[PDB]
Design a binder for this molecule. Sequence first.
Ligand code: SF4
Ligand SMILES: [Mg+2]
Ligand SMILES: [Mg+2]
Ligand SMILES: [Mg+2]
Ligand SMILES: [Mg+2]
Ligand SMILES: [Mg+2]
Ligand SMILES: [Mg+2]
Ligand SMILES: [Mg+2]
Ligand SMILES: [Mg+2]
Ligand SMILES: [Mg+2]
Ligand SMILES: [Mg+2]
Ligand SMILES: [Mg+2]
Ligand SMILES: [Mg+2]
Ligand SMILES: [Mg+2]
Ligand SMILES: [Mg+2]
Ligand SMILES: [Mg+2]
Ligand SMILES: [Mg+2]
Ligand SMILES: [Mg+2]
Ligand SMILES: [Mg+2]
Ligand SMILES: [Mg+2]
Ligand SMILES: [Mg+2]
Ligand SMILES: [Mg+2]
Ligand SMILES: [Mg+2]
Ligand SMILES: [Mg+2]
Ligand SMILES: [Mg+2]
Ligand SMILES: [Mg+2]
Ligand SMILES: [Mg+2]
Ligand SMILES: [Mg+2]
Ligand SMILES: [Mg+2]
Ligand SMILES: [Mg+2]
Ligand SMILES: [Mg+2]
Ligand SMILES: [Mg+2]
Ligand SMILES: [Mg+2]
Ligand SMILES: [Mg+2]
Ligand SMILES: [Mg+2]
Ligand SMILES: [Mg+2]
Ligand SMILES: [Mg+2]
Ligand SMILES: [Mg+2]
Ligand SMILES: [Mg+2]
Ligand SMILES: [Mg+2]
Ligand SMILES: [Mg+2]
Ligand SMILES: [Mg+2]
Ligand SMILES: [Mg+2]
Ligand SMILES: [Mg+2]
Ligand SMILES: [Mg+2]
Ligand SMILES: [Mg+2]
Ligand SMILES: [Mg+2]
Ligand SMILES: [Mg+2]
Ligand SMILES: [Mg+2]
Ligand SMILES: [Mg+2]
Ligand SMILES: [Mg+2]
Ligand SMILES: [Mg+2]
Ligand SMILES: [Mg+2]
Ligand SMILES: [Mg+2]
Ligand SMILES: [Mg+2]
Ligand SMILES: [Mg+2]
Ligand SMILES: [Mg+2]
Ligand SMILES: [Mg+2]
Ligand SMILES: [Mg+2]
Ligand SMILES: [Mg+2]
Ligand SMILES: [Mg+2]
Ligand SMILES: [Mg+2]
Ligand SMILES: [Mg+2]
Ligand SMILES: [Mg+2]
Ligand SMILES: [Mg+2]
Ligand SMILES: [Mg+2]
Ligand SMILES: [Mg+2]
Ligand SMILES: [Mg+2]
Ligand SMILES: [Mg+2]
Ligand SMILES: [Mg+2]
Ligand SMILES: [Mg+2]
Ligand SMILES: [Mg+2]
Ligand SMILES: [Mg+2]
Ligand SMILES: [Mg+2]
Ligand SMILES: [Mg+2]
Ligand SMILES: [Mg+2]
Ligand SMILES: [Mg+2]
Ligand SMILES: [Mg+2]
Ligand SMILES: [Mg+2]
Ligand SMILES: [Mg+2]
Ligand SMILES: [Mg+2]
Ligand SMILES: [Mg+2]
Ligand SMILES: [Mg+2]
Ligand SMILES: [Mg+2]
Ligand SMILES: [Mg+2]
Ligand SMILES: [Mg+2]
Ligand SMILES: [Mg+2]
Ligand SMILES: [Mg+2]
Ligand SMILES: [Mg+2]
Ligand SMILES: [Mg+2]
Ligand SMILES: [Mg+2]
Ligand SMILES: [Mg+2]
Ligand SMILES: [Mg+2]
Ligand SMILES: [Mg+2]
Ligand SMILES: [Mg+2]
Ligand SMILES: [Mg+2]
Ligand SMILES: [Mg+2]
Ligand SMILES: [Mg+2]
Ligand SMILES: [Mg+2]
Ligand SMILES: [Mg+2]
Lengths: 82, 208, 121, 95, 99
Amino acid sequence: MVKIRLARFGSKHNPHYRIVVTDARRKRDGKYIEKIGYYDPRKTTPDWLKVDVERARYWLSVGAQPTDTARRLLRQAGVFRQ
Amino acid sequence: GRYIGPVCRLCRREGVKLYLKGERCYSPKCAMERRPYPPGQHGQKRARRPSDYAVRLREKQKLRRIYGISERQFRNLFEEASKKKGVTGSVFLGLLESRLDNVVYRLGFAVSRRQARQLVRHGHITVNGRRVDLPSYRVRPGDEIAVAEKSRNLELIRQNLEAMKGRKVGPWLSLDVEGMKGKFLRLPDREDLALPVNEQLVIEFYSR
Amino acid sequence: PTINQLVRKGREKVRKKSKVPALKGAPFRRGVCTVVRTVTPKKPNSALRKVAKVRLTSGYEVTAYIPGEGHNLQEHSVVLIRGGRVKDLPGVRYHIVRGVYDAAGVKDRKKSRSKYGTKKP
Amino acid sequence: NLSALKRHRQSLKRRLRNKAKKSAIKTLSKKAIQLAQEGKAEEALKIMRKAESLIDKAAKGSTLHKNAAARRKSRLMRKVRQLLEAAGAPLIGGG
Amino acid sequence: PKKVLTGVVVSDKMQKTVTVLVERQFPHPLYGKVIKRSKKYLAHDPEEKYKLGDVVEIIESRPISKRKRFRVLRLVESGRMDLVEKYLIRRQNYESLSK
RNA sequence: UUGGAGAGUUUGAUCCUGGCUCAGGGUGAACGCUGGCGGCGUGCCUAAGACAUGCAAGUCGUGCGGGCCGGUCAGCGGCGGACGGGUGAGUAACGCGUGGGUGACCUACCCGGAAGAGGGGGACAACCCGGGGAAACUCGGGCUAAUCCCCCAUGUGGACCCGCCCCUUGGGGUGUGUCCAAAGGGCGCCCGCUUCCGGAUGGGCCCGCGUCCCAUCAGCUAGUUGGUGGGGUAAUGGCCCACCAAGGCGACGACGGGUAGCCGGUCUGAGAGGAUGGCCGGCCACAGGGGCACUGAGACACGGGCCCCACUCCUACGGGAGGCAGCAGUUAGGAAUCUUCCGCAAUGGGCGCAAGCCUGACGGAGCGACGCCGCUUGGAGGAAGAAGCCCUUCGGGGUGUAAACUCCUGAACCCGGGACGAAACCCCCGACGAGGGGACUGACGGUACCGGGGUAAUAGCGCCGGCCAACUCCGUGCCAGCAGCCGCGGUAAUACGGAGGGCGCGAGCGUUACCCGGAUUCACUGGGCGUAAAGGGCGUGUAGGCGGCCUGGGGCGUCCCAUGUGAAAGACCACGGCUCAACCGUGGGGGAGCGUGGGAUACGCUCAGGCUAGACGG
Ligand code: SF4
Ligand SMILES: [Mg+2]
Ligand SMILES: [Mg+2]
Ligand SMILES: [Mg+2]
Ligand SMILES: [Mg+2]
Ligand SMILES: [Mg+2]
Ligand SMILES: [Mg+2]
Ligand SMILES: [Mg+2]
Ligand SMILES: [Mg+2]
Ligand SMILES: [Mg+2]
Ligand SMILES: [Mg+2]
Ligand SMILES: [Mg+2]
Ligand SMILES: [Mg+2]
Ligand SMILES: [Mg+2]
Ligand SMILES: [Mg+2]
Ligand SMILES: [Mg+2]
Ligand SMILES: [Mg+2]
Ligand SMILES: [Mg+2]
Ligand SMILES: [Mg+2]
Ligand SMILES: [Mg+2]
Ligand SMILES: [Mg+2]
Ligand SMILES: [Mg+2]
Ligand SMILES: [Mg+2]
Ligand SMILES: [Mg+2]
Ligand SMILES: [Mg+2]
Ligand SMILES: [Mg+2]
Ligand SMILES: [Mg+2]
Ligand SMILES: [Mg+2]
Ligand SMILES: [Mg+2]
Ligand SMILES: [Mg+2]
Ligand SMILES: [Mg+2]
Ligand SMILES: [Mg+2]
Ligand SMILES: [Mg+2]
Ligand SMILES: [Mg+2]
Ligand SMILES: [Mg+2]
Ligand SMILES: [Mg+2]
Ligand SMILES: [Mg+2]
Ligand SMILES: [Mg+2]
Ligand SMILES: [Mg+2]
Ligand SMILES: [Mg+2]
Ligand SMILES: [Mg+2]
Ligand SMILES: [Mg+2]
Ligand SMILES: [Mg+2]
Ligand SMILES: [Mg+2]
Ligand SMILES: [Mg+2]
Ligand SMILES: [Mg+2]
Ligand SMILES: [Mg+2]
Ligand SMILES: [Mg+2]
Ligand SMILES: [Mg+2]
Ligand SMILES: [Mg+2]
Ligand SMILES: [Mg+2]
Ligand SMILES: [Mg+2]
Ligand SMILES: [Mg+2]
Ligand SMILES: [Mg+2]
Ligand SMILES: [Mg+2]
Ligand SMILES: [Mg+2]
Ligand SMILES: [Mg+2]
Ligand SMILES: [Mg+2]
Ligand SMILES: [Mg+2]
Ligand SMILES: [Mg+2]
Ligand SMILES: [Mg+2]
Ligand SMILES: [Mg+2]
Ligand SMILES: [Mg+2]
Ligand SMILES: [Mg+2]
Ligand SMILES: [Mg+2]
Ligand SMILES: [Mg+2]
Ligand SMILES: [Mg+2]
Ligand SMILES: [Mg+2]
Ligand SMILES: [Mg+2]
Ligand SMILES: [Mg+2]
Ligand SMILES: [Mg+2]
Ligand SMILES: [Mg+2]
Ligand SMILES: [Mg+2]
Ligand SMILES: [Mg+2]
Ligand SMILES: [Mg+2]
Ligand SMILES: [Mg+2]
Ligand SMILES: [Mg+2]
Ligand SMILES: [Mg+2]
Ligand SMILES: [Mg+2]
Ligand SMILES: [Mg+2]
Ligand SMILES: [Mg+2]
Ligand SMILES: [Mg+2]
Ligand SMILES: [Mg+2]
Ligand SMILES: [Mg+2]
Ligand SMILES: [Mg+2]
Ligand SMILES: [Mg+2]
Ligand SMILES: [Mg+2]
Ligand SMILES: [Mg+2]
Ligand SMILES: [Mg+2]
Ligand SMILES: [Mg+2]
Ligand SMILES: [Mg+2]
Ligand SMILES: [Mg+2]
Ligand SMILES: [Mg+2]
Ligand SMILES: [Mg+2]
Ligand SMILES: [Mg+2]
Ligand SMILES: [Mg+2]
Ligand SMILES: [Mg+2]
Ligand SMILES: [Mg+2]
Ligand SMILES: [Mg+2]
Ligand SMILES: [Mg+2]
């Protein structure tokens, strides 16, 4: 099924994740349906986490299942906030 | 890494004084004031007419040996300057003048670019507080260059700043001898550098 | 030609020819010496040039020049050959590499030692 | 050395079940078409009803796809109606 | 949208099928001159209304057979035997090209 | 307007034409000499040759009955195994690219909505007993559970025939007739089950345009081309079959032969163009060589099955086992390409309510100057200038501030400290919701880094006749040898070998191979044909290419506007993180082509009406 997850970019010992929506059978660094956010786990920048809230809401509404880390990041960005 | 052999022979070959030694360059025993001909067995024979390629090569080698930079780094800097918007000769001269070792040589913390390289490499220089140990670091306008707080009580540094209390730095720089700290105001102008170099010759050399 | 003639026929590209076909696309080839001898050059040069007949791993059998003063090659010596013809010798298109397999380096060589395969003294 | 052996065993059992069901479907369809060709309309529709019920199941499972079952039913009903039209009067069911 | 082409009927020897000759122009990619090319399409003609010389429009459709993926949409004009004559003369000239 | 260099060589000398050669850049490189540190990338291009050994896909006891001592083992039953990983053999093709179509189609798990979940029956494993077999395994008798199988009922609904209506390729409604549902488990909920509609994702099929060389390959085709009926499929279709007609394709290059995975991109180039497709992302094909189907939502399935062939192994000779183009590794071939490493801590994936389990994907470490980037082998002072070596006009000149020598700093080393990457799932409250509180978890790694001590600490390679930067001595004597071209060498060689000196680069420097450039030397940009290579021996003429003046219509080419597409990465610009850089992150802009809607009509095209300067006739 469609999932909202993290695709790894960057370089060795320097991970930079993209929060993307894609089919679950695609390899993790392959082509995705669209891109909604980004994450820097090392937090080397003032803005180390961005999420498209409206697009994430849309994709959640149509049955996309986030991963644990993706769900945590979406909650930090305030996607599930009511 | 870099050239670590005899250095006055470079001046004698280029036919001009490249101040690559410091105090001895202004002394009467400067090798360009005693034997102003090229080194080797045939240095005192009448010179033949130099070809165009020879002229451009000698001008480029003079410019490169003034700053003591390898040819790979020199050419990379030249191509970078050619990519930038702005007159490529002036941009290239500014990029060369923004190297940390050259900047601390001009500020007066050293008497030669070689000594400035050893100062920067050995962890005696700080840029904006944090310590930098890389000669190739490129200083941007506004950056503060200074001697490390624990390096202020160093005899070589003390003498260097003593001998500069009278000398005045260029317009593109500011120095505080009491504060033991410099400031890089702007990119140096082409007229502010007393360089015996025609940069058009260097550009034409790299067009080949 | 007219534009219509160019549309009908076009311009023919130029096809280059290999000068080292026995190398079969490789930079070097290993071979075994069958005949070692000396040959005489064409006009105006005069010499006795040392060559070897080499049967290669690629299936061809060619003639290769032996550079440098003095050599230890003989029948059944294993050698490496590289491209490059010898101008004044007819039919010689390849050079033996000194210092590889059974071809020793040039003895007492002091200049240009990376060629001729001589170690630093 | 794996769990592929279990898959092969189960596949053989499912193959037996699917073959049995499809054979029964084919036999019933042929019987209904022949009876309609006789015409002989009363028993032809009863056999056709049996064939239709045996087509709709096991289209509930992996034996037949729904579209395949629909096509089977459509072809059978069309052939039966054509043959009975070539014959005389109709009977109950299947109309 | 479904592609619509315009052409002239050059063959109607098959049942319920017409051969339509479609022409297109394009500049040469490197030499720039505008050039003409033609292509034949087998088109479904169930009612057999269109005959030799008809200029018609055909539209991309569900496969009717092999080689038959277009349907005649409408008639554009009639009485165009000159285009057919050009095609037939070009075809006839091939007999003298052999060895 | 960011962008463009030429030289040597045909002559006694000259101009031109023209070939050859060179100076630049690049590579999955290789070979020679040399070799200190780190970061980031990258490493079988050949035999798609053959492979020892270990690992690379399992999981569920909250579906079920069991043997064994809360576990363990196997069995039945689900889901996964069609993804992920590898390779480039085949393929010149709707395979790929780009834009579209499907009233001709499928889609497990996920999400939303509607409705339902009633009753009855049964079998096969496991298991207990006999056999057969060397083994691999296999047969018979009997028992038994389920979310296993079957039947009946019910019909929110849906499937089929036949009508009817609208719509128009098989789309959507409606009427009689016929047919089709289901399963439980855990502590009132939760996880599950059945029918249908919708969404989202992922696919099948079809079409326009583009997609290499040879015409000394010119004709090809008989399921061939079309039609009718049928079979098969999720679905169109000669896909397959029976019958009827005689068609289909081709110089705009059919057919045949050779070669080749294709693209985003990459290298080169002033651009146009040329070459190329390693790594990374997308698609396709293949899994010892061939064929085939089964199961399944999905395969004709790399670590599933069957058969034939080659090969390897067991042997009681009847029979049986196997497939590294997964990760390492071996062997063969080759000029040439690595560890039988660590860990699931991160991200992703399968199963499971969960705990968790599995994951050679992946995150990391190792090896190789294979590439790029950064760094070190010291800094200052120091003789009209030691010794050695080389040259000399015998006065001297050079190596050379170079050395020695004094002062300074402090890579390696030592001691101590010490990471980020990891906050979730989990539990408590709240209502297992939203929202708050708490805890566990590090392979890399005692690594990066930080603080305090600390020694003067690798340099080599090519070249020095012209092109082309850098010259003298000795040795040899058409020999030895050098050579990219022109050419050097035959007793006074700046061209061979050595030495002193010099030039260029520098942990590298050269050489070979291949590609672009220079080559305006296939000339679209941007060449030519009297005598340099080049006008067909001459007519007539087919296809094709091109075409006079004026008026109107169309708006196909052409141009403009809006909109969709032109993925990500790469290229450009700006900002930012690693002490800089390489490298990486964020944002912005471009961009040929193609679809759609609108507009313009000068030119080309096309239709219509005129004119006589071209052409023809009297
Ligand atoms: S002393 Fe004179 S010759 Fe020597 S390096 Fe200084 S300026 Fe050059
Ligand atoms: Mg002309
Ligand atoms: Mg000679
Ligand atoms: Mg040398
Ligand atoms: Mg299982
Ligand atoms: Mg039967
Ligand atoms: Mg199925
Ligand atoms: Mg079916
Ligand atoms: Mg065409
Ligand atoms: Mg066309
Ligand atoms: Mg038809
Ligand atoms: Mg013939
Ligand atoms: Mg000559
Ligand atoms: Mg020339
Ligand atoms: Mg002549
Ligand atoms: Mg001459
Ligand atoms: Mg090497
Ligand atoms: Mg070492
Ligand atoms: Mg490394
Ligand atoms: Mg390979
Ligand atoms: Mg494992
Ligand atoms: Mg895969
Ligand atoms: Mg291939
Ligand atoms: Mg191939
Ligand atoms: Mg092939
Ligand atoms: Mg072919
Ligand atoms: Mg297409
Ligand atoms: Mg497309
Ligand atoms: Mg029973
Ligand atoms: Mg017994
Ligand atoms: Mg039994
Ligand atoms: Mg029994
Ligand atoms: Mg069931
Ligand atoms: Mg029923
Ligand atoms: Mg290509
Ligand atoms: Mg037939
Ligand atoms: Mg056929
Ligand atoms: Mg056909
Ligand atoms: Mg492209
Ligand atoms: Mg460019
Ligand atoms: Mg370009
Ligand atoms: Mg490829
Ligand atoms: Mg393929
Ligand atoms: Mg194969
Ligand atoms: Mg094999
Ligand atoms: Mg399934
Ligand atoms: Mg099936
Ligand atoms: Mg397959
Ligand atoms: Mg298989
Ligand atoms: Mg499999
Ligand atoms: Mg395998
Ligand atoms: Mg079978
Ligand atoms: Mg066999
Ligand atoms: Mg026996
Ligand atoms: Mg392997
Ligand atoms: Mg392979
Ligand atoms: Mg091998
Ligand atoms: Mg070899
Ligand atoms: Mg070998
Ligand atoms: Mg290699
Ligand atoms: Mg994991
Ligand atoms: Mg996980
Ligand atoms: Mg395992
Ligand atoms: Mg490693
Ligand atoms: Mg480097
Ligand atoms: Mg010194
Ligand atoms: Mg941490
Ligand atoms: Mg420590
Ligand atoms: Mg310290
Ligand atoms: Mg010179
Ligand atoms: Mg010579
Ligand atoms: Mg030499
Ligand atoms: Mg001599
Ligand atoms: Mg030379
Ligand atoms: Mg010499
Ligand atoms: Mg260039
Ligand atoms: Mg030229
Ligand atoms: Mg060209
Ligand atoms: Mg040119
Ligand atoms: Mg031209
Ligand atoms: Mg010419
Ligand atoms: Mg002429
Ligand atoms: Mg002329
Ligand atoms: Mg003549
Ligand atoms: Mg010519
Ligand atoms: Mg002539
Ligand atoms: Mg003539
Ligand atoms: Mg002639
Ligand atoms: Mg004549
Ligand atoms: Mg004619
Ligand atoms: Mg004529
Ligand atoms: Mg003629
Ligand atoms: Mg004509
Ligand atoms: Mg138009
Ligand atoms: Mg893009
Ligand atoms: Mg920065
Ligand atoms: Mg970006
Ligand atoms: Mg439009
Ligand atoms: Mg006109
Ligand atoms: Mg007219």
